[PDB]
Amino acid sequence: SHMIIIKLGGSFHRHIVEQIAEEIAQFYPDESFILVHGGGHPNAREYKITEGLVGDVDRKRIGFSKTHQAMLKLNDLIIQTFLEKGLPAYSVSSSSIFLLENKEVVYGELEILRKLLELKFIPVLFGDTAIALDKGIDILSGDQIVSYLAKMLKPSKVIFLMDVDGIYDRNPKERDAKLIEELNVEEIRHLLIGNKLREALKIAKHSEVYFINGKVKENLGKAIRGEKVGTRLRKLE
Amino acid sequence: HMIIIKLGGSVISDYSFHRHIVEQIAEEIAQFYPDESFILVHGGGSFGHPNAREYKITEGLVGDVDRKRIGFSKTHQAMLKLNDLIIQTFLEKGLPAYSVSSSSIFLLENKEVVYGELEILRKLLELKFIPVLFGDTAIALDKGIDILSGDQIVSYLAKMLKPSKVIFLMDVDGIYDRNPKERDAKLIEELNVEEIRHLLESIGNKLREALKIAKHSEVYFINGKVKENLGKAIRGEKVGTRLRKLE
Ligand SMILES: Nc1ncnc2c1ncn2[C@@H]1O[C@H](COP(=O)(O)OP(=O)(O)O)[C@@H](O)[C@H]1O
Ligand SMILES: Nc1ncnc2c1ncn2[C@@H]1O[C@H](COP(=O)(O)OP(=O)(O)O)[C@@H](O)[C@H]1O
Ligand SMILES: C/C=C/COP(=O)(O)O
Ligand SMILES: C/C=C/COP(=O)(O)O
User: Fold this and answer.
1) Where does substrate bind (chain B) (predicted)?
2) Which ligand is nearest to the CA of B200?
């Protein structure tokens, strides 16, 4: 309905979080917002959590817990930044409501998020460690959380704040690239970032998708208002 | 074949830290893990209680609802901080404790859980993890925002998963005659519904939750500041107050 999901990339830059909160404050509270950020990941690679519950099991469990705690610290920093700006952002543990199989959320709990949104709260989830029915433990990325929430909650739009202006033709590092302001299935179906494109193809069934540069503040508001900004992938037909 | 250990807010804290007794509980549990499953619900402590009192969370979403939402989030963050302390302490002792946000799976009505999600907890206990829940802020359907105590969490988990025993760690050796402040008080070794009811006619919440829990599990009330007390409570040994399973 009148709900918007916002996903954040990677860097801790406090000023950019301040800008994101200030832009979100333009539509609170008559517009519902769910926030999702990413890594914590250093512990994810150091403990090879994606390897599963194989080999040294106890060390993998300890690293699972430590990575979750580091993600909680980063999430608390973001939460306090949002709270100082007068926004009631509430932390929701992703690993406490989600269960994966093959890097995909196959079990979820969403009544708590619904009651948070109803009471004019802003839930904030994170890419996190997670329990996986196949290989015991796994790393759940924020893109999968966004995909599941789009499957179930069906937001009005999903906005990805990236380090670059949006989806490009060539690699942004390889100059002479061009920006695609209007994205559709045929262009996304070019895979020779990729996982984000597959998740966007899955999400466009339910909601509009925006890819905008989070470094520019006003950008966020534009994507929420529907103005031309970055890359836009409309709802599929 | 599952044990639920509740840690009082006044034993593991009081803005004190009390890391020594947390290490003690960690070693006591390590004496039994992995051959046994443990859920640990730690109390509010000196972290979420001051914020809840200052922002008046238990009153609900009334008056200054914006400031109350801000205080809701701040209290949740303080409880997450204390949970990080406890979980790090449990991790350095070689035990795999994992955080579960109580406010992320529970929904309250009249100071008790009326909506819950336990599949994540089940999968955590299956994979030989130790889940660490805590008293928290909570979304209440009647008053909007409320404070969910660890006792109600333990009661809901007991009526849900049906553990073998539920062990409370308190400041005192267990349940006494009257207030242990009075000098003519004697610890009860075997509790029953009669002396319970006779005592409430004069903690209150602990006794109600224990009366509900005894329908599913055996209750223990012991002093958490002593080492072997937890281990004696894990077995059927005589320690503190014992409330046998209802029959
Ligand atoms: N065609 C493209 N358009 C935009 N970015 C691209 C493209 N190809 C590669 N990239 C790069 O891929 C990266 C995607 O960011 P990513 O690490 O996936 O974010 P997250 O960690 O949030 O998933 C960007 O930093 C960008 O430089
Ligand atoms: N009959 C009794 N037996 C034991 N403790 C009692 C009794 N009457 C009063 N108390 C006091 O009540 C307190 C109970 O604390 P409690 O509220 O259970 O802690 P928490 O807030 O962590 O649940 C104890 O510290 C104890 O001093
Ligand atoms: C613990 C880290 C999980 C991954 O986070 P993310 O890919 O970038 O959204
Ligand atoms: C922020 C409040 C948490 C609950 O406190 P508790 O009584 O002692 O379990």
Assistant:
1) 44, 49, 150
2) 2
